[PDB]
Amino acid sequence: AALVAHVTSGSGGSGGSGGSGRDLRAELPLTLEEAFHGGERVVEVAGRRVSVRIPPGVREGSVIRVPGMGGQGNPPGDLLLVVRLLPHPVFRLEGQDLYATLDVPAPIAVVGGKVRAMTLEGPVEVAVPPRTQAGRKLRLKGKGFPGPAGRGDLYLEVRIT
């Protein structure tokens, strides 16, 4: 597989009511960007190659249920993919909302210029408040993850350096 390592036992989050057949369990190193993207990636479980589309809005230790993929038959069994985000973090998904650190120079902070902040969809350009403060969260709405309230928003933790 691409990101999926292989089948394991006691993968993570042992308390998910499912199976109803054969439980397939597997862990995979996931990129932060792929936690956002949630597209079709190849899984290799017991020599079975399928294209699995895990849902956007996934995190470190997040257990993903894909029905029909575990128990191959009429009683649908699922595959619990416990993803393992890279030792590189930047974006904290809290439910539907984001927190990512924004380090701006003091010249831009005081004039209230614009800084390109890296996000999991690409580049966003945040216009910092004129004479902004370090420790603030710059709310870029419609730049969060999916959820109950539609799409969330990004809180940029300003560092006037």
Side-chain angles (χ1 to χ4, degrees), residues 76-156:
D78 65 280
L79 161 59
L80 288 181
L81 292 179
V82 183
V83 309
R84 307 301 306 252
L85 299 188
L86 305 187
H88 162 49
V90 50
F91 267 68
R92 289 192 52 133
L93 177 59
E94 310 301 290
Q96 181 183 327
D97 306 303
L98 297 175
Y99 291 81
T101 311
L102 180 67
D103 58 300
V104 310
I108 287 195
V110 300
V111 306
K114 60 180 298 178
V115 179
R116 288 182 178 181
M118 147 45 52
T119 179
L120 302 181
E121 59 174 85
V124 293
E125 303 187 289
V126 51
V128 306
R131 302 175 179 191
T132 195
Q133 295 71 32
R136 291 183 59 169
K137 288 78 190 181
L138 306 186
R139 183 182 58 237
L140 308 188
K141 304 195 69 64
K143 292 293 186 293
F145 278 62
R151 202 182 187 197
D153 53 90
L154 170 55
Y155 295 115
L156 290 167

Coordinates of all heavy atoms in Angstrom, one line a residue, residues 76-156:
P76 N -21.8 -7.1 6.3 CA -20.7 -6.2 6.0 C -19.8 -6.0 7.2 O -20.2 -5.6 8.3 CB -21.4 -4.9 5.6 CG -22.9 -5.2 5.5 CD -23.1 -6.4 6.4
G77 N -18.5 -6.3 7.1 CA -17.5 -6.1 8.0 C -16.6 -4.9 7.6 O -16.5 -4.7 6.4
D78 N -16.1 -4.1 8.5 CA -15.4 -2.9 8.2 C -13.9 -3.0 8.5 O -13.4 -4.0 9.1 CB -16.0 -1.7 9.1 CG -15.8 -1.9 10.6 OD1 -16.5 -2.7 11.2 OD2 -14.8 -1.3 11.1
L79 N -13.1 -2.0 8.0 CA -11.7 -1.9 8.3 C -11.4 -0.6 9.1 O -11.7 0.4 8.6 CB -10.9 -2.0 6.9 CG -9.5 -1.5 6.9 CD1 -8.5 -2.2 7.8 CD2 -8.9 -1.5 5.4
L80 N -10.9 -0.8 10.3 CA -10.6 0.3 11.2 C -9.1 0.7 11.0 O -8.2 0.1 11.4 CB -10.8 0.0 12.7 CG -12.3 -0.1 13.1 CD1 -12.5 -0.5 14.6 CD2 -13.1 1.2 12.8
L81 N -9.0 1.8 10.2 CA -7.7 2.4 9.9 C -7.3 3.5 11.0 O -7.9 4.6 11.0 CB -7.7 3.1 8.5 CG -7.8 2.1 7.3 CD1 -7.8 2.8 5.9 CD2 -6.6 1.1 7.3
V82 N -6.4 3.1 11.9 CA -5.9 4.1 12.9 C -4.7 4.8 12.3 O -3.6 4.2 12.1 CB -5.5 3.3 14.2 CG1 -5.0 4.3 15.3 CG2 -6.7 2.4 14.7
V83 N -4.9 6.1 11.9 CA -3.9 6.9 11.3 C -2.9 7.5 12.3 O -3.3 7.7 13.5 CB -4.4 8.0 10.4 CG1 -5.5 7.5 9.4 CG2 -5.0 9.2 11.2
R84 N -1.7 7.6 11.9 CA -0.6 8.1 12.8 C 0.1 9.3 12.1 O 0.9 9.2 11.1 CB 0.5 7.0 12.9 CG -0.1 5.6 13.4 CD -0.8 5.7 14.8 NE 0.1 6.3 15.8 CZ 0.7 5.7 16.8 NH1 0.5 4.4 17.0 NH2 1.4 6.4 17.7
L85 N -0.3 10.5 12.5 CA 0.1 11.8 11.8 C 1.6 11.9 12.1 O 2.2 11.5 13.1 CB -0.7 13.0 12.3 CG -2.2 13.0 12.1 CD1 -2.8 14.4 12.4 CD2 -2.5 12.6 10.6
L86 N 2.3 12.6 11.1 CA 3.8 12.7 11.0 C 4.3 13.4 12.3 O 3.6 14.2 12.9 CB 4.2 13.5 9.7 CG 3.7 12.9 8.4 CD1 4.4 13.7 7.2 CD2 4.0 11.4 8.2
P87 N 5.6 13.1 12.7 CA 6.3 13.9 13.8 C 6.4 15.4 13.6 O 6.8 16.1 14.5 CB 7.7 13.2 13.9 CG 7.5 11.9 13.2 CD 6.5 12.1 12.1
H88 N 6.0 15.8 12.4 CA 5.8 17.2 12.0 C 4.3 17.6 12.2 O 3.5 17.0 11.4 CB 6.3 17.5 10.5 CG 5.7 18.7 9.9 ND1 5.8 19.9 10.5 CD2 5.1 18.9 8.7 CE1 5.2 20.8 9.7 NE2 4.8 20.2 8.6
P89 N 3.9 18.4 13.2 CA 2.6 19.0 13.3 C 2.6 20.5 12.9 O 3.7 21.1 12.7 CB 2.3 18.8 14.8 CG 3.6 18.9 15.5 CD 4.7 18.6 14.5
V90 N 1.5 21.0 12.6 CA 1.3 22.5 12.4 C -0.2 22.9 12.7 O -0.5 23.8 13.4 CB 1.7 23.0 11.0 CG1 1.1 22.2 9.8 CG2 1.4 24.5 10.8
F91 N -1.1 22.0 12.1 CA -2.6 22.3 12.2 C -3.2 21.3 13.3 O -3.0 20.1 13.2 CB -3.2 22.0 10.8 CG -3.4 23.3 10.0 CD1 -2.2 23.9 9.5 CD2 -4.6 23.9 9.8 CE1 -2.3 25.1 8.9 CE2 -4.7 25.1 9.1 CZ -3.6 25.7 8.7
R92 N -3.8 22.0 14.3 CA -4.6 21.3 15.3 C -6.1 21.4 14.9 O -6.7 22.5 14.9 CB -4.4 22.0 16.7 CG -3.1 21.7 17.3 CD -3.1 22.1 18.8 NE -4.2 21.5 19.6 CZ -4.1 20.9 20.7 NH1 -3.0 20.8 21.4 NH2 -5.2 20.4 21.3
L93 N -6.7 20.3 14.5 CA -8.1 20.2 14.3 C -8.8 19.9 15.6 O -8.7 18.8 16.1 CB -8.5 19.1 13.2 CG -10.0 18.9 13.0 CD1 -10.7 20.2 12.5 CD2 -10.3 17.8 12.0
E94 N -9.6 20.9 16.1 CA -10.4 20.7 17.3 C -11.9 20.6 16.8 O -12.5 21.7 16.6 CB -10.2 21.9 18.3 CG -8.7 22.2 18.6 CD -7.9 21.1 19.2 OE1 -8.2 20.7 20.4 OE2 -7.0 20.5 18.6
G95 N -12.4 19.4 16.6 CA -13.7 19.1 16.1 C -13.8 19.5 14.6 O -13.5 18.7 13.7
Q96 N -14.2 20.8 14.4 CA -14.4 21.4 13.0 C -13.5 22.6 12.8 O -13.2 22.9 11.6 CB -15.9 21.8 13.0 CG -16.4 22.4 11.6 CD -17.9 22.8 11.7 OE1 -18.7 22.3 12.4 NE2 -18.2 23.9 11.0
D97 N -12.9 23.1 13.9 CA -12.1 24.3 13.9 C -10.6 24.0 13.9 O -10.2 22.9 14.2 CB -12.4 25.1 15.2 CG -13.9 25.4 15.4 OD1 -14.5 26.0 14.5 OD2 -14.4 25.0 16.4
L98 N -9.8 25.0 13.5 CA -8.3 24.9 13.4 C -7.6 25.8 14.3 O -8.1 26.9 14.7 CB -7.9 25.1 11.9 CG -8.5 24.1 10.9 CD1 -8.1 24.4 9.5 CD2 -8.0 22.7 11.3
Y99 N -6.4 25.4 14.6 CA -5.4 26.3 15.3 C -4.0 26.0 14.7 O -3.6 24.9 14.6 CB -5.3 25.9 16.8 CG -6.5 26.3 17.7 CD1 -7.7 25.5 17.7 CD2 -6.5 27.5 18.5 CE1 -8.8 25.9 18.5 CE2 -7.6 27.8 19.2 CZ -8.7 27.0 19.2 OH -9.8 27.3 20.0
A100 N -3.4 27.0 14.1 CA -2.1 26.9 13.5 C -1.3 28.2 13.8 O -1.9 29.3 13.8 CB -2.2 26.8 12.0
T101 N 0.0 28.1 14.1 CA 0.8 29.2 14.5 C 1.2 30.1 13.3 O 1.6 29.5 12.3 CB 2.1 28.7 15.3 OG1 1.7 27.7 16.3 CG2 2.8 29.9 16.0
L102 N 1.0 31.4 13.5 CA 1.3 32.4 12.5 C 2.4 33.3 13.0 O 2.2 34.0 13.9 CB 0.1 33.2 12.1 CG 0.3 34.3 11.0 CD1 0.6 33.7 9.6 CD2 -0.9 35.3 11.0
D103 N 3.7 33.2 12.5 CA 4.8 34.0 12.9 C 5.0 35.2 11.9 O 5.4 34.9 10.8 CB 6.1 33.2 13.2 CG 6.5 32.4 11.9 OD1 5.8 31.5 11.4 OD2 7.7 32.6 11.4
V104 N 4.6 36.4 12.3 CA 4.7 37.6 11.5 C 5.8 38.5 12.0 O 6.1 38.6 13.2 CB 3.3 38.4 11.4 CG1 2.2 37.4 11.1 CG2 3.1 39.2 12.8
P105 N 6.6 39.2 11.1 CA 7.6 40.2 11.5 C 6.9 41.5 12.1 O 5.8 41.8 11.7 CB 8.3 40.6 10.2 CG 7.3 40.3 9.1 CD 6.5 39.2 9.6
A106 N 7.6 42.1 13.1 CA 7.1 43.3 13.8 C 6.7 44.5 12.8 O 5.6 45.1 13.0 CB 8.1 43.8 14.8
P107 N 7.5 44.8 11.7 CA 7.1 45.8 10.6 C 5.7 45.5 10.1 O 4.8 46.4 10.1 CB 8.1 45.5 9.5 CG 9.4 45.2 10.3 CD 8.9 44.4 11.5
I108 N 5.4 44.2 9.7 CA 4.0 43.8 9.1 C 3.0 43.9 10.2 O 1.8 44.3 10.0 CB 4.1 42.4 8.4 CG1 4.8 42.5 7.1 CG2 2.7 41.8 8.3 CD1 4.6 41.4 6.1
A109 N 3.3 43.5 11.5 CA 2.4 43.5 12.6 C 1.8 44.9 12.9 O 0.6 45.0 13.2 CB 3.1 42.9 13.8
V110 N 2.7 45.9 12.9 CA 2.3 47.2 13.3 C 1.6 48.0 12.1 O 0.7 48.7 12.3 CB 3.6 48.0 13.8 CG1 4.2 47.3 15.0 CG2 4.7 48.2 12.7
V111 N 2.1 47.8 10.8 CA 1.5 48.4 9.6 C 0.1 47.7 9.3 O -0.8 48.3 8.7 CB 2.4 48.5 8.4 CG1 3.8 49.1 8.7 CG2 2.6 47.1 7.8
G112 N 0.0 46.4 9.7 CA -1.1 45.6 9.4 C -1.1 45.1 7.9 O -2.0 45.3 7.2
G113 N 0.1 44.5 7.5 CA 0.3 44.0 6.2 C -0.3 42.6 6.0 O -1.2 42.2 6.8
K114 N 0.1 41.8 5.0 CA -0.4 40.5 4.7 C 0.8 39.5 4.8 O 1.9 39.8 4.4 CB -1.1 40.4 3.3 CG -0.2 40.8 2.1 CD -1.0 40.7 0.8 CE -1.4 39.3 0.4 NZ -2.2 39.3 -0.8
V115 N 0.5 38.3 5.3 CA 1.4 37.2 5.4 C 0.8 35.9 4.8 O -0.4 35.6 5.0 CB 1.8 36.9 6.9 CG1 2.8 35.7 7.1 CG2 2.4 38.2 7.6
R116 N 1.6 35.2 4.0 CA 1.2 33.9 3.5 C 1.4 32.8 4.6 O 2.5 32.5 5.0 CB 1.9 33.5 2.2 CG 1.5 34.3 0.9 CD 2.3 33.9 -0.3 NE 1.8 34.7 -1.5 CZ 2.3 34.5 -2.8 NH1 3.2 33.6 -3.1 NH2 1.8 35.2 -3.7
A117 N 0.2 32.3 5.1 CA 0.2 31.2 6.1 C 0.0 29.9 5.3 O -1.0 29.8 4.5 CB -0.9 31.5 7.1
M118 N 0.8 28.9 5.6 CA 0.7 27.6 5.1 C -0.6 26.9 5.7 O -0.7 26.9 7.0 CB 2.0 26.8 5.3 CG 1.9 25.2 5.6 SD 0.7 24.3 4.5 CE 1.2 24.8 2.8
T119 N -1.4 26.3 4.9 CA -2.6 25.5 5.3 C -2.6 24.2 4.5 O -2.0 24.1 3.4 CB -3.9 26.3 5.2 OG1 -5.0 25.4 5.6 CG2 -4.2 26.8 3.8
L120 N -3.4 23.2 5.0 CA -3.5 21.9 4.4 C -4.2 21.8 3.0 O -4.2 20.7 2.4 CB -4.2 20.9 5.4 CG -3.5 20.8 6.8 CD1 -4.2 19.8 7.7 CD2 -2.0 20.4 6.7
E121 N -4.8 22.9 2.6 CA -5.4 23.0 1.3 C -4.5 23.8 0.3 O -4.7 23.7 -0.9 CB -6.8 23.8 1.4 CG -6.7 25.2 2.0 CD -8.0 26.0 1.9 OE1 -8.9 25.8 2.8 OE2 -8.3 26.7 0.9
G122 N -3.5 24.5 0.8 CA -2.6 25.3 0.0 C -2.1 26.5 0.7 O -1.8 26.4 1.9
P123 N -1.8 27.7 0.0 CA -1.5 28.9 0.7 C -2.8 29.8 0.9 O -3.7 30.0 0.0 CB -0.6 29.6 -0.4 CG -1.1 29.1 -1.7 CD -1.8 27.8 -1.5
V124 N -2.9 30.3 2.1 CA -3.9 31.4 2.5 C -3.1 32.7 2.8 O -2.0 32.6 3.3 CB -4.8 31.1 3.7 CG1 -5.8 29.9 3.3 CG2 -4.0 30.7 5.0
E125 N -3.6 33.8 2.4 CA -3.0 35.1 2.7 C -3.8 35.9 3.7 O -4.9 36.4 3.4 CB -2.8 35.9 1.3 CG -2.1 35.2 0.3 CD -1.8 36.0 -1.0 OE1 -2.7 36.3 -1.8 OE2 -0.6 36.4 -1.2
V126 N -3.3 36.0 4.9 CA -4.0 36.6 6.1 C -3.5 38.1 6.2 O -2.3 38.3 6.4 CB -3.8 35.8 7.4 CG1 -2.3 35.4 7.6 CG2 -4.4 36.5 8.6
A127 N -4.4 39.0 6.1 CA -4.1 40.4 6.4 C -4.2 40.7 7.9 O -5.3 40.7 8.5 CB -5.0 41.4 5.6
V128 N -3.0 40.7 8.6 CA -2.9 40.9 10.0 C -3.5 42.3 10.4 O -3.3 43.3 9.7 CB -1.4 40.7 10.6 CG1 -0.8 39.4 10.1 CG2 -0.5 41.9 10.1
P129 N -4.2 42.4 11.6 CA -4.7 43.7 12.1 C -3.5 44.8 12.2 O -2.4 44.4 12.6 CB -5.3 43.4 13.5 CG -5.6 41.9 13.4 CD -4.6 41.3 12.5
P130 N -3.8 46.1 11.8 CA -2.8 47.2 12.1 C -2.6 47.3 13.6 O -3.5 47.5 14.4 CB -3.5 48.4 11.5 CG -5.0 48.1 11.4 CD -5.0 46.6 11.1
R131 N -1.3 47.2 14.0 CA -0.8 47.2 15.4 C -1.4 46.0 16.1 O -1.7 46.2 17.3 CB -1.1 48.6 16.1 CG -0.6 49.8 15.4 CD -1.1 51.1 16.0 NE -0.5 52.3 15.4 CZ -0.6 53.6 15.9 NH1 -1.2 53.8 17.0 NH2 0.0 54.6 15.2
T132 N -1.4 44.8 15.5 CA -1.8 43.6 16.1 C -0.9 43.2 17.3 O 0.2 43.7 17.5 CB -2.0 42.4 15.1 OG1 -2.8 41.3 15.7 CG2 -0.6 41.8 14.7
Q133 N -1.4 42.2 18.1 CA -0.6 41.7 19.3 C -0.3 40.2 19.1 O -1.0 39.5 18.4 CB -1.5 41.9 20.6 CG -1.8 43.4 21.0 CD -2.8 44.1 20.0 OE1 -3.7 43.5 19.5 NE2 -2.7 45.4 19.9
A134 N 0.9 39.8 19.7 CA 1.3 38.4 19.7 C 0.5 37.7 20.8 O 0.3 38.2 21.9 CB 2.8 38.3 20.0
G135 N 0.0 36.5 20.4 CA -0.9 35.7 21.3 C -2.3 35.7 20.8 O -3.1 35.0 21.3
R136 N -2.6 36.5 19.8 CA -3.9 36.6 19.1 C -4.2 35.4 18.2 O -3.2 34.8 17.8 CB -4.1 37.9 18.4 CG -4.2 39.2 19.3 CD -4.4 40.5 18.5 NE -5.7 40.4 17.8 CZ -6.2 41.5 17.2 NH1 -5.7 42.7 17.3 NH2 -7.4 41.3 16.5
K137 N -5.4 35.2 17.9 CA -5.9 34.2 16.9 C -6.6 34.8 15.8 O -7.7 35.4 16.0 CB -6.8 33.1 17.6 CG -6.0 32.1 18.6 CD -5.6 32.7 20.0 CE -4.7 31.9 20.8 NZ -4.4 32.5 22.1
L138 N -6.1 34.8 14.5 CA -6.7 35.5 13.4 C -7.6 34.5 12.7 O -7.1 33.5 12.1 CB -5.6 36.0 12.4 CG -4.5 36.9 13.0 CD1 -3.6 37.5 12.0 CD2 -5.2 38.1 13.9
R139 N -8.9 34.7 12.8 CA -9.9 33.8 12.4 C -10.2 33.9 10.8 O -10.8 34.9 10.4 CB -11.2 34.1 13.2 CG -12.4 33.2 12.9 CD -13.7 33.6 13.8 NE -14.1 35.0 13.5 CZ -14.2 36.0 14.4 NH1 -14.0 35.8 15.7 NH2 -14.6 37.2 14.0
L140 N -9.7 32.9 10.1 CA -10.0 32.8 8.6 C -11.1 31.8 8.4 O -10.9 30.6 8.5 CB -8.7 32.3 7.9 CG -7.4 33.1 8.1 CD1 -6.3 32.7 7.1 CD2 -7.6 34.7 8.0
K141 N -12.4 32.4 8.3 CA -13.6 31.6 8.2 C -13.8 31.0 6.8 O -13.4 31.6 5.8 CB -14.8 32.4 8.6 CG -14.7 33.0 10.0 CD -16.1 33.5 10.6 CE -17.0 32.3 11.0 NZ -16.5 31.4 12.0
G142 N -14.3 29.7 6.8 CA -14.4 28.9 5.5 C -13.1 28.4 5.1 O -12.9 28.1 3.9
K143 N -12.2 28.2 6.0 CA -10.8 27.6 5.8 C -10.6 26.5 6.8 O -9.4 26.0 6.9 CB -9.7 28.7 5.9 CG -9.8 29.8 4.7 CD -9.4 29.1 3.4 CE -9.3 30.1 2.2 NZ -10.6 30.8 1.9
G144 N -11.6 26.1 7.6 CA -11.5 25.0 8.5 C -11.7 23.6 7.9 O -11.5 23.5 6.7
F145 N -12.1 22.6 8.7 CA -12.5 21.3 8.2 C -14.1 21.2 8.1 O -14.8 22.0 8.7 CB -11.9 20.2 9.0 CG -10.5 19.8 8.7 CD1 -9.5 20.8 8.8 CD2 -10.1 18.5 8.3 CE1 -8.1 20.4 8.6 CE2 -8.8 18.2 8.1 CZ -7.8 19.2 8.2
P146 N -14.6 20.1 7.4 CA -16.1 19.9 7.4 C -16.6 19.5 8.8 O -15.8 19.2 9.7 CB -16.3 18.7 6.4 CG -14.9 18.0 6.4 CD -13.9 19.2 6.5
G147 N -17.9 19.7 9.0 CA -18.6 19.4 10.3 C -20.1 19.7 10.3 O -20.7 20.0 9.3
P148 N -20.7 19.6 11.5 CA -22.2 19.9 11.7 C -22.6 21.3 11.2 O -23.7 21.5 10.6 CB -22.4 19.8 13.3 CG -21.2 18.9 13.7 CD -20.1 19.3 12.8
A149 N -21.7 22.3 11.5 CA -22.0 23.7 11.1 C -21.4 24.0 9.7 O -21.2 25.2 9.4 CB -21.4 24.6 12.2
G150 N -21.2 23.0 8.9 CA -20.7 23.2 7.5 C -19.2 23.1 7.4 O -18.6 22.0 7.5
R151 N -18.5 24.2 7.3 CA -17.1 24.3 7.4 C -16.6 25.3 8.5 O -17.3 26.3 8.7 CB -16.5 24.8 6.0 CG -15.0 24.4 5.8 CD -14.3 24.9 4.6 NE -13.0 24.3 4.4 CZ -12.0 24.7 3.7 NH1 -12.1 25.8 2.8 NH2 -10.8 24.1 3.7
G152 N -15.6 24.9 9.2 CA -15.0 25.6 10.3 C -14.1 26.8 9.9 O -14.2 27.2 8.8
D153 N -13.3 27.2 10.8 CA -12.4 28.3 10.7 C -11.1 28.2 11.3 O -10.9 27.4 12.3 CB -13.1 29.6 11.2 CG -13.6 29.6 12.6 OD1 -12.9 29.9 13.5 OD2 -14.8 29.2 12.8
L154 N -10.1 28.9 10.8 CA -8.7 28.7 11.2 C -8.3 29.9 12.2 O -8.5 31.0 11.9 CB -7.7 28.8 10.0 CG -6.2 28.9 10.2 CD1 -5.6 27.8 11.2 CD2 -5.4 29.0 8.9
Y155 N -7.7 29.5 13.4 CA -7.2 30.4 14.4 C -5.7 30.5 14.3 O -5.0 29.6 14.7 CB -7.7 30.0 15.8 CG -9.2 30.1 16.0 CD1 -9.9 28.9 16.3 CD2 -9.9 31.3 16.0 CE1 -11.3 29.0 16.5 CE2 -11.2 31.3 16.2 CZ -11.9 30.2 16.5 OH -13.3 30.3 16.7
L156 N -5.2 31.6 13.7 CA -3.7 31.8 13.6 C -3.1 32.5 14.8 O -3.3 33.6 15.1 CB -3.6 32.8 12.4 CG -3.9 32.1 11.1 CD1 -4.0 33.1 9.9 CD2 -2.9 31.0 10.7

